[PDB]
Symmetry: C3
Subunit: 410 residues, 3 copies
């Protein structure tokens, strides 16, 4: 009986969660909320957590095979260099956005009864080294997001080199495997949309609790982050796209004139993908060559989400702050590096980057298996659909921009 | 040098195990049996244990893709509804069969020196929740039958939805994967028949011991179960099939008249599969439409083993009773739910349902990694080929019945 | 990266140049400068190999087992696998007796944890056999467990083939696409070998910049001792094993080498059993051998049938035993024979294949690479690998040309 505008569907359980919560954080005892409504956001949280392991790894084998030299011609060398440098700046700017806003801190929580401890971050030599997983199976098997990453990328570059192989038997294998890995990837996102369908219930319970148990003080903080994000996203559009459209030859204000339909679709769809027969239509409607908008636009569909990278920058900081954790330089620029990858393999479905955030949380020090960490995560997971729209939308823009700059080079 | 009627082959080591045992549980010291002949049933037990994990999972991804809406047309909606409601009643009736007989209890054993403890079955909220595996890889990797299941069925439903996909790249992946997962499944059953070949040795040692060390008191108890099963199987045939054949239009006593050859083959083959060019032949020799007996008969080959579902009902109870464990309501109707699935993905080979029993043992509270549990399992594993015949046979009948009732609807 | 040279000479450069930056800094300077600074670079190397060890035991053996599996090979190949299996089996026997003559390692006595290597107590036979049917195959791979992993590979790869014999199509296509996927893991995994093998000069540099830094000059001999124990076993294999049965059948054994010159030298410098196949099959035709005979056997001997590796894995397991202070027992003696047969059977035939695959046979005698001491002794002999890899690679290639010629006479 449940099938509605799947974005409005959430926004309904969200403004209506905040309200069933807030009041039962008065008249009633939110240990009625705690015992009864809470397990439902938990069923939600977990269902995502599930996907986090397959879809880090499955994704990155695929996505790594997407860029791998020598697997892309020089028409695509001159676009990946763009994609990589653009989405890297985006997280830099997400860090500096959430460095301006203190999104979270003062939302101080300590769920175990004890405040989050950071287990002692060890000698550099070991921390680097300790990421070549000694048994890659083990890595996936239990947890280990980092090695699991290094092992995906390593495989995914190898995978491609076997398609270059002078041998047939070797190539058909190499392929059928790369195929099977994708399809895991895909089927795994199919499960995302699965859970995303449970999402209204889940998101209901999630801020029926942030409102129930964090008082009204969270409301601001949740907004503070939204602000930190959007005002960074449009700070990205202005200080980052318009900045280099002007550098090359494309009239930057009129760029938006033709690219209107794409971005709005990207916004309300909350799916970088959904907006591609809208993006490529727009792409043709601005001089762009058949072969150029055929490579780049549907490759920027998955790889190249500046909107996600900035998101995962401000999200990692919202968790740091939540816990009571000084996110250190170094682990600063880890966020830059890890949210680049974290973006690179973020689906471009509905709630992709919220799951993929785990990867970058995990890599700075905050493992989702840590009551405190996974509390601060369960919170920002509640205002995700609200970020997912500006997010999705920039992600789509960033492909139209790069397509246009490299169009000028050809 | 060993190649005989592979069913008579076992029944030889079985009546000749019970005899080498029983006597060496007198004149000689069955700590000669314990040290010398026993490791040979163990090599057997383990070899099955091995398969249990791949073939729960590989099976259920495949088998879930077999039913998954929307993957089956309404000709098969009107048969799966049958299959699911029939095999469900079968375990209900298996529970009530072994509720009448006390198959096991008084076979009280305590192998660790200590009697089986049940580790404390925790808060409902957690027990449900705690089956969305947090890392699917982990789940399989170490043990975890339940989540492993949930994740199978969740994947296999997703898998199918990608074949519905408007995209080609997406469908070919989705396929090659679903292909690879099968073939695991298959190659895994190939290993079953492997082990099943060692089985005569294995089954020899198994009741050369139940006879050596349990006294003669077991002999009855082993029969008690056989009784509890067969008199449940033919109680199924009479009170369940004849009951609804009479409800629709098919003359129920004459149904058996044409279906003779199928059932006997099913009996001696001990392979639901072997009996399909025999089942479909009989299916044509009773008015059934080419398209109807083409869908349902070879789909009832794997899915829809009323005979297995009942088996796993009475087996779970034989272990409960063996240990000294009151199998509780709830975990009662768990057995109903779990042995439905446990049946749904039971191979339809030789010794399929014996392995797949673990899945349903495991799910009530008795994990095969618990000396006591896996002692009670190693015993009933010895009279498996004796059940496997009545079992196999009903499984085959249940497809011919459903085919005939849904034939009347068309 | 600017780094692309004769990839074998490339290593031999960082090796004679490691030994020299090491040796001296084990005087003037304090090799706790070496220890803190240059050492992690060999470790990045060691680890990168270790990575591969698990996939490429398993992926390899599923494939390789499907290579032999009856009934998957006709009687033209029955009469060659029987050769291959008996030849490579004797090779490790001869590797054991080579390193039984030389004491390669011992007196290189090390105890890294501060404590000397303990052997954890090798349990009742019944359990030790039994305990190799992995109870959860996933578990096995997942965490470590080389032996079961193997048993489970070989068990699958035999089954895999049986499904291709299947009267059913749906059953065969699956069976295949899977057996395809598993290969390609296999293959992609060895692509990663060559990857690491490219880092190798750095890695090998650091590795004996240390064995030279911290083991004094005493190691230098010991490292050579092994090389000796290997080569003088390899050419003891050629003379006492090949020439011995070429003379038994009909082929003039000294003139055999006359036509097979080009193949062996290529095999030597390539350090790649595979690279030397359009060289091996060319020579194979230039000695009467039938089109159908040298088409089956030579490129099947490419991967399966590395006498040169089997002997290597024999002397290597002994170099580790000796290093630690471990009496390698009979039983675990003939384990080495059995395990280095398989260990060879699925050794890639790439560059540094058999060094990785050694882990499989170390692991199966009692020395698990997860044991500081064990994986110290391993990191050492890993440094003089490219030096062995040449004689090794080369014999591996010879042994296919021999078997091809003997079974040629039978046809
Ligand atoms: N919302 C983004 C992906 C993400 O969730 O980060 C998109 O689909 O475009
Ligand atoms: N014996 C059944 C399956 C099972 O063992 O439960 C059949 O093959 O029909
Ligand atoms: N060097 C051998 C394989 C090995 O390293 O053992 C070859 O490629 O022929
Ligand atoms: Hg919150
Ligand atoms: Hg018994
Ligand atoms: Hg050394
Ligand atoms: Na995008
Ligand atoms: Na992405
Ligand atoms: Na059936
Ligand atoms: Na079944
Ligand atoms: Na070879
Ligand atoms: Na080999």
């Amino acid at each position: 009986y449940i099938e509605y505008p799947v974005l409005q569907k959430i926004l309904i359980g969200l403004i209506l969660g905040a309200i069933v919560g807030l009041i039962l954080g008065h008249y009633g005892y939110a240990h009625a909320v705690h015992t009864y409504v809470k397990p439902f956001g938990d069923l939600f949280v977990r269902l995502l957590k599930m996907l986090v392991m397959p879809i880090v790894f499955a994704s990155l084998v695929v996505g790594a095979a997407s860029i791998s030299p020598a697997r892309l011609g020089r028409v695509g060398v001159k676009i990946v260099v763009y994609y990589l440098l653009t989405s890297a700046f985006a997280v830099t700017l997400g860090i500096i956005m959430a460095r301006l806003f203190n999104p979270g801190a003062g939302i101080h929580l300590a769920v175990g009864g004890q405040q989050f401890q950071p287990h002692q971050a060890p000698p550099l030599v070991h921390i680097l080294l300790d990421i070549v997983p000694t048994n890659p199976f083990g890595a996936l098997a239990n947890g280990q997001v980092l090695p699991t990453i290094f092992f995906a990328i390593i495989l995914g570059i190898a995978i491609t080199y076997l398609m270059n192989s002078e041998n047939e038997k070797v190539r058909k294998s190499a392929e059928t495997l790369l195929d099977a890995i994708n399809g895991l990837a895909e089927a795994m996102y199919k499960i995302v949309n699965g859970v995303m369908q449970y999402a209204p219930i889940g998101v209901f319970a999630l801020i029926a609790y942030c409102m129930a148990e964090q008082g009204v003080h969270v409301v601001g903080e949740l907004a503070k982050v939204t602000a930190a994000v959007y005002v960074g996203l449009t700070l990205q559009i202005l200080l980052v796209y318009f900045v280099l459209l002007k550098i090359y030859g494309i009239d930057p204000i009129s760029f938006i004139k033709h690219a209107k339909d794409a971005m709005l679709t990207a916004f309300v769809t909350r799916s970088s993908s959904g907006t591609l027969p809208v993006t490529m239509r727009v792409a043709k409607e601005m001089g762009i060559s058949e072969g150029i908008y055929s490579f780049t636009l549907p490759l920027g569909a998955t790889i190249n989400m500046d909107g996600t990278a900035l998101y995962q920058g401000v999200a990692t900081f919202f968790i740091a702050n939540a816990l009571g954790s000084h996110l250190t330089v170094g682990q600063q620029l880890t966020i830059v590096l890890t949210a680049v990858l974290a973006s690179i393999g973020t689906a471009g479905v509905p709630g992709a980057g919220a799951i993929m955030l785990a990867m970058v949380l995990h890599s700075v020090g905050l493992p989702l298996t840590d009551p405190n960490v996974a509390a601060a995560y369960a919170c920002i997971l509640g205002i995700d659909a609200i970020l997912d729209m500006g997010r999705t939308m920039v992600n789509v823009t960033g492909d139209l921009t790069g397509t246009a700059i490299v169009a000028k080079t050809e």
